[PDB]
């Protein structure tokens, strides 16, 4: 895509609220992709992706930026927990990214084949018509062996139209050129002064960012120009605790601000397909019409902020648990309330929540 950095941020504002510095940082990395293609043969090999390190408390949108970014560029995407490797091989990151790129380009290939998939009597009828047991590591291998053994109209036409050798070669080029990976909670593999096992994971991840080659059943993939987005609260450790070889491979740094009560009020409504809009369409399925007052949206955001300050701050994720606890009575009766217009006023919010928010011992369970 040829979108300029401001055009990228403007699209991210349709989903993510605030955190513009993180939006500006990801826009720079995605714009350098298009900038690299316009360069000559020599510079395209020397220039490498400007990988980003997001820093901030949980639930502030570090992942949603990476998700919407890859969804914006139609790029292959995967999220991985860095701690998973403290105990799987690191090369699986590129494998799973390709398997997602395969299904992505494949279902997209069906889209091109879908729409392809007269006598007066011809139009008349046309109008009326309208076992192999293996350990877990090789379970995917025995799958392919079983599919090889089995080998030895929408389905037959789409198979006739599709080019399987093209879809497999394309997904590699979609990964080598446009791929994106998100390494969540990278701060937890930094040295606490386990430090050998923690820093050992950093060394195992190093070739993926330094440019290496990973074999896959779909083909041979190179990790040279893949973009990476690490994230971590970095409250315990600091980015300087990362190994020097890794710090130099994350040229862009950014800190995401903690969300405020006003941000919660915006997140509930402004973003496209916001959670409040979702239940409004859900209750519309039952014939019920729900409407949230601005005071009702205010106290909901006020309720989530209190739980985060009372016990544990989980970020905007607290909005999900609170909203479902508020609408639980409506969602159950929504079948019997068909044809009725329900209003979520400030009194309705205080009725279903203030008794719960007041008891911190209960808030740790119900919310």
């Amino acid at each position: 895509s040829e979108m300029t950095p401001r055009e990228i941020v403007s699209e991210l504002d349709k989903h993510i609220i605030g955190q513009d510095n993180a939006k500006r940082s990801v826009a720079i990395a995605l714009r350098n992709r298009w900038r690299r293609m316009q360069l000559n043969e020599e510079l395209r090999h020397e220039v490498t992706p400007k990988n980003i390190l997001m820093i901030g408390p949980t639930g502030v949108g570090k992942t949603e930026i990476a998700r919407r970014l890859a969804k914006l560029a139609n790029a292959p995407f995967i999220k991985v927990e860095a701690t998973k490797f403290t105990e799987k091989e690191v090369d699986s990151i590129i494998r799973d990214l390709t398997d997602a790129a395969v299904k992505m380009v494949r279902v997209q290939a069906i889209e091109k084949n879908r729409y392809r998939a007269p006598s007066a009597a011809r139009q008349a009828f046309r109008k009326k018509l309208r076992e192999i047991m293996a350990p877990p590591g090789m379970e995917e291998m025995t799958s392919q062996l079983q599919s090889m053994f089995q080998n030895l109209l929408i389905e037959e036409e789409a198979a006739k139209l599709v080019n399987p050798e093209e879809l497999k070669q394309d997904a590699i080029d979609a990964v080598e050129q446009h791929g994106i990976v998100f390494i969540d909670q990278i701060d937890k593999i930094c040295k606490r002064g386990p430090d050998v096992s923690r820093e050992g994971v950093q060394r195992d991840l190093l070739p993926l960012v330094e440019g290496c080659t990973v074999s896959t059943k779909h083909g041979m993939v190179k990790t040279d120009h893949i973009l990476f987005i690490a994230s971590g609260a970095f409250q315990i450790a600091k980015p300087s605790d990362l190994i020097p070889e890794l710090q130099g491979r994350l040229p862009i740094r950014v800190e995401l601000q903690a969300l405020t009560t006003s941000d919660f009020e915006r997140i509930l409504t402004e973003p496209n397909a916001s959670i409040t809009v979702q239940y409004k369409a859900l209750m519309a399925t039952e014939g019920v019409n729900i409407e949230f007052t601005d005071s009702g949206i205010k106290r909901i955001a006020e309720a989530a902020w209190q739980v985060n300050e009372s016990t544990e701050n989980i970020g905007a994720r607290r909005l999900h648990t609170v909203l479902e606890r508020l609408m639980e009575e409506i969602s159950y009766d929504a079948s019997d309330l068909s044809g009725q217009n329900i209003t979520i006023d400030a009194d309705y919010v205080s009725k279903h929540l203030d008794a719960l928010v007041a008891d911190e011992d209960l808030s740790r369970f119900i919310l």
């Binding site: 409250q235 315990i236 903690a258 300050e309 701050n313």
Partner: protein, 174 residues
């Protein structure tokens, strides 16, 4: 060693002497036993080894970041790991810390304590300073800075382990 903390009229201070004793000898008379923490929003002091406090202060800032700067909850988590960790259990010091919210004491036994008027007085000369600060706070209109200053000087005249070198960090919130 003596360290005092007073809170009055929207102001809170922490003052401490600079004497470092080795047996019956003075090792260093200009020790800075008071410093600021958490991006200048928190003041703190310590009675004990210098490095033992620097370790506990850094970890205290970590607990503040996890708890959004909440002083009481971060103090409990520090006292929790202090008693628990085999490494931190070896540390021997008496910490004093305060913000615009309240003042409290932290110990190596894991005990967190808030004095009656947020009036902290620790160290070998602590009781001497608490006696003087208690007198001025109830009988004068002196600011918290003047009370901690005069109380620490009296503790230095009495306690042989306390001198008159002073280090203060005031915090105004009003």
């Amino acid at each position: 060693t003596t360290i005092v903390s007073v809170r009055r009229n929207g102001h809170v201070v922490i003052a401490g002497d600079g004497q470092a004793t080795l047996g019956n000898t003075v090792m260093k008379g200009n020790v800075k036993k008071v410093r600021r923490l958490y991006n200048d929003k928190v003041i703190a002091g310590f009675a004990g080894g210098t490095a033992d406090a620097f370790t506990l202060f850094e970890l205290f800032e970590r607990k503040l970041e996890m708890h959004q700067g909440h002083l009481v909850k971060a103090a409990v988590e520090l006292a929790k790991d202090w008693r628990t960790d085999r490494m931190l259990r070896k540390l021997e010091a008496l910490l004093a810390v305060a913000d615009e919210t309240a003042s409290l004491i932290i110990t190596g036994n894991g005990d967190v304590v808030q004095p009656e008027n947020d009036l902290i007085a620790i160290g070998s000369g602590g009781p001497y300073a608490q006696a003087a600060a208690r007198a001025l706070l109830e009988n004068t209109e002196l600011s918290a800075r003047e009370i901690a200053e005069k109380a620490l000087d009296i503790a230095g005249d009495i306690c042989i382990y306390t001198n008159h070198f002073h280090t203060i960090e005031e915090l105004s919130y009003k």
